[PDB]
Design a protein around this nucleic acid. Structure first.
Ligand SMILES: *C[C@H]1C(=O)C2CCN1CC2
Ligand SMILES: *C[C@H]1C(=O)C2CCN1CC2
Ligand SMILES: *C[C@H]1C(=O)C2CCN1CC2
Ligand SMILES: *C[C@H]1C(=O)C2CCN1CC2
Ligand SMILES: C[C@@H]1C(=O)C2CCN1CC2
Ligand SMILES: C[C@@H]1C(=O)C2CCN1CC2
Ligand SMILES: [Zn+2]
Ligand SMILES: [Zn+2]
Lengths: 197, 197
DNA sequence: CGGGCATGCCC
DNA sequence: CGGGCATGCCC
């Protein structure tokens, strides 16, 4: 009955975890992940690699879904959407969707008929031989600050592993801040965490 | 042949001048006019009174037109428009128009067929007996900072007095900055003028 | 109300 | 590149 999807971490029977490349906090970096905050800082429309880790290999036909939700209680029931400006500015991705996947010939974009929430889905592919994870290249097509979209409200990205039958196999999430200067904003929030948290 | 309307002050044979109420520079004022900068600072969608002064009474059927243009040379040829967000948010005023007139049952909104520029027109009415000017209540429906609209670019409002035949009778203009805190921004720009101009 | 931070971006 | 200002708004 809820229109708010779960954000509860569920590693599940396949040991599903997310991973992120080690970047620095240089003021001009295009993205950087804070493990202390479980938070990705990245720039508008630029690659944001997410690693998928599993302890056991999911069955054939497993799918990987990404969806954004507002992190604060007072905004959780509102659907996260592209702002009118960037919407009016790919072909496969409808202009209303915040999250895109690049580099994948099998991407599917969903608008839920009951909850109206947007998600983007790709097939799960096992890591190549010798590699321990699979990487998906996400793109966030608005800044957190965009008026008429996120309007400065923080968001979570929820990644779910789902089998072809629709069984939830795993769930993980991270906060995302799409901003002009990811390195500066990570440094500021981490400093604020240490001194005022 | 030019698609850029004139901004040249032309008092004309009727002695046409603009006037503005004396406001202060309190941080929360809804609008304030700087004579030193010939610049109105005002808030989004709130009243911005403009006084019309004439030395001689224009003929019956005179009209008062307002139009915005970008002040900087590099943007002058681009049409000033409402941003996509506030456009998607009166009835008589088309959503694309930046400048509205409130309180007037005879307002006309024009989209020029050749230049595509927007303007808003009302009849000229002489001042009431004993009064020296006529006031028009303008509304600016975007902030200067709106992405996809003015996008932080400065603008002029050009007020023209025109007879019913379309003869230009007078022209005046002022800079406009639609901002959150008109009193603060006037104080800052005037201080910057005095010390760095 | 006014002080002050967060965030985009400096033509 | 990084320093720093301008501007919206603080839940
Ligand atoms: C944002 C992400 C990238 O695209 C590379 C630079 C920074 N971070 C790790 C690798
Ligand atoms: C963070 C800041 C920089 O360092 C350049 C890229 C992003 N932003 C504007 C210029
Ligand atoms: C903005 C304009 C108004 O509406 C009154 C207050 C400030 N200024 C003069 C009168
Ligand atoms: C300027 C500042 C104020 O003083 C209030 C009105 C406008 N802005 C936000 C709150
Ligand atoms: C997760 C794993 C790694 O650490 C590197 C880059 C991505 N994957 C294969 C090698
Ligand atoms: C221009 C003139 C004034 O100064 C007051 C207010 C508006 N007009 C009539 C009286
Ligand atoms: Zn946007
Ligand atoms: Zn706007």
């Amino acid at each position: 009955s809820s229109s708010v999807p779960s954000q509860k971490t569920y590693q599940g029977s396949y040991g599903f975890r997310l991973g992120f490349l080690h970047s620095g906090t240089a003021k001009s970096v295009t993205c950087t992940y804070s493990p202390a905050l479980n938070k990705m800082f990245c720039q508008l429309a630029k690659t944001c690699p997410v690693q998928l880790w599993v302890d056991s290999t999911p069955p054939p036909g497993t799918r990987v879904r990404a969806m954004a939700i507002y992190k604060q209680s007072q905004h959780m029931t509102e659907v996260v959407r592209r702002c009118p400006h960037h919407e009016r500015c790919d072909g496969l991705a409808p202009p209303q969707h915040l999250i895109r996947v690049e580099g994948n010939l099998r991407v599917e974009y969903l608008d839920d008929r009951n909850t109206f929430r947007h998600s983007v889905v790709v097939p799960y592919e096992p890591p190549e031989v010798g590699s321990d994870c699979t990487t998906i290249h996400y793109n966030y097509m608005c800044n957190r600050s965009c008026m008429g979209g996120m309007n400065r409200r923080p968001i979570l990205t929820i990644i779910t592993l789902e089998d072809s039958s629709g069984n939830l196999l795993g769930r993980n999430s991270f906060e995302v801040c799409v901003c002009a200067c990811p390195g500066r904003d990570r440094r500021t929030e981490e400093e604020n965490l240490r001194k005022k948290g």
